Amino acid sequence: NSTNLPRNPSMADYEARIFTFGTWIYSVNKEQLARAGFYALGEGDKVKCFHCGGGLTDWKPSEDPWEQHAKWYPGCKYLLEQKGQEYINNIHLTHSL
Ligand SMILES: CN[C@@H](C)C(=O)N[C@H](C(=O)N1CCC[C@H]1Cn1nnnc1Sc1ccccc1)[C@@H](C)OCC#CC#CCO[C@H](C)[C@H](NC(=O)[C@H](C)NC)C(=O)N1CCC[C@H]1Cn1nnnc1Sc1ccccc1
Ligand SMILES: [Zn+2]
């Protein structure tokens, strides 16, 4: 019929997300992480996408969350929505060496 809404529709609001990044000890921008649909799980730099539940760790001190979301989770709709299919495609294209 119609499909694909978020698994944890309680992390849909940016506020709810930066909420968790209060005790964030990492140089990976909390805001860009939250703004990218991410939220800390409570262990390490372990985050997830609120929509596609895509998990990410091992963040480099200067990674751009938006680039990572594309790469690891191309089929996220939230990503598609905020960034558009060219972005995702462009990211993946630059990757190629
Ligand atoms: C650099 N920028 C950061 C953001 C980054 O890229 N981080 C990477 C990362 O977090 N990734 C890579 C894609 C997946 C994601 C990890 N992930 N996925 N899901 N959750 C997570 S982390 C997490 C976990 C819990 C809560 C929140 C987050 C990565 C470096 O982090 C490590 C991790 C982990 C984990 C795991 C899942 O493992 C796979 C499912 C797989 N296991 C299987 O049973 C598969 C289905 N069977 C084939 C797996 O571990 N594999 C598959 C073949 C062998 C191994 C791959 N491998 N080889 N050597 N090391 C590895 S582990 C690995 C995983 C992804 C990329 C590279 C290496
Ligand atoms: Zn996602």
From Swiss-Prot:
Crosslink site: Glycyl lysine isopeptide (Lys-Gly) (interchain with G-Cter in ubiquitin): 71, 77
Sequence segments annotated as region (Required for interaction with SEPTIN4 isoform ARTS): 11-26
Organism: Homo sapiens
Subcellular location: Cytoplasm; Nucleus
The name this protein goes by in its record: E3 ubiquitin-protein ligase XIAP
Function comment: Multi-functional protein which regulates not only caspases and apoptosis, but also modulates inflammatory signaling and immunity, copper homeostasis, mitogenic kinase signaling, cell proliferation, as well as cell invasion and metastasis. Acts as a direct caspase inhibitor. Directly bind to the active site pocket of CASP3 and CASP7 and obstructs substrate entry. Inactivates CASP9 by keeping it in a monomeric, inactive state.
Family of this protein: Belongs to the IAP family.
Region (Required for interaction with DIABLO), start-end ranges: 78-97
Residues of the full protein shown: 252 to 348 of 497
